[PDB]
C-alpha cells in the first residue's frame, strides 16, 4: 500500500475487540486513542501537542491490528479528538515516507 497525502491517511484498526479509524501520523512520537477500556494496568502520562497538554493513560504491550498488520506496543488513552497511530507503531508495520 502506497498512501498519497491529498486526503488524511486514515486507516482501520482493530484494538481490544473493537474497530476504529485512526490517522497515520508521522508527526506523533506516540499512539493516542480516544477513551476506551483496555487490559491490564496503566500509568498516568501527560503529552503535549499544539495548543497544550492532555492527561492520558499509558498501556504497554497492547495488541493492535493496523490495516491488517499486527503490532504490539504502547498505546495512550485519553481525550484526543482523533485516533492517532504514531511512529512507535508505524515502525512495527514497516511504514516509510517516500519522495
10 lines the binding site for ligand 1UN (CB under 6 A): no
Instruction: Name which position in 86, 90, 93, 95 contacts ligand 1UN (CB under 6 A).
Output: 86
85 lines the binding site for ligand 1UN (CB under 6 A): no
27 Cβ contact partners less than 8 Å away, ≥ 6 residues apart: none
| Catalytic position from the list 15, 22, 25, 80 | 25
Q: Answer yes or no: 29 catalytic.
A: no
22 lines the binding site for ligand 1UN (CB under 6 A): no
67 Cβ contact partners less than 8 Å away, ≥ 6 residues apart: 1, 11, 12, 13, 93
Distance CA 10, CA 59 (A): 22
Helix (H, G, I), strand (E, B) or coil at 91: helix
Nearest to 39 by CA among 63, 20, 69, 72: 63
Site map (CB under 6 A) of ligand 1UN, residues 31-70, x = contact: -x--------------xxxx--------------------
* Per-residue cell: 91: 515502525
Give catalytic residues, as residue numbers.
Answer: 25
Which residues make up the interface to ligand 1UN (CB under 6 A)?
A: 23, 25, 27-30, 32, 47-50, 80-82, 84, 86
Amino acid at each position: 500500500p502506497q498512501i498519497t497525502l491529498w486526503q488524511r491517511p486514515l486507516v482501520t484498526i482493530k484494538i481490544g475487540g473493537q474497530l476504529k479509524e485512526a490517522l497515520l501520523d508521522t508527526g506523533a512520537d506516540n499512539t493516542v486513542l480516544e477513551e476506551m477500556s483496555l487490559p491490564g494496568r496503566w500509568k498516568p502520562k501527560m503529552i503535549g501537542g499544539i495548543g497544550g497538554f492532555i492527561a492520558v493513560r499509558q498501556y504497554d504491550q497492547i495488541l493492535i491490528e493496523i490495516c491488517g498488520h499486527k503490532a504490539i506496543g504502547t498505546v495512550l488513552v485519553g481525550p484526543t479528538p482523533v485516533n492517532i497511530i504514531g511512529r512507535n507503531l508505524m515502525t512495527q508495520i514497516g511504514c516509510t515516507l517516500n519522495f
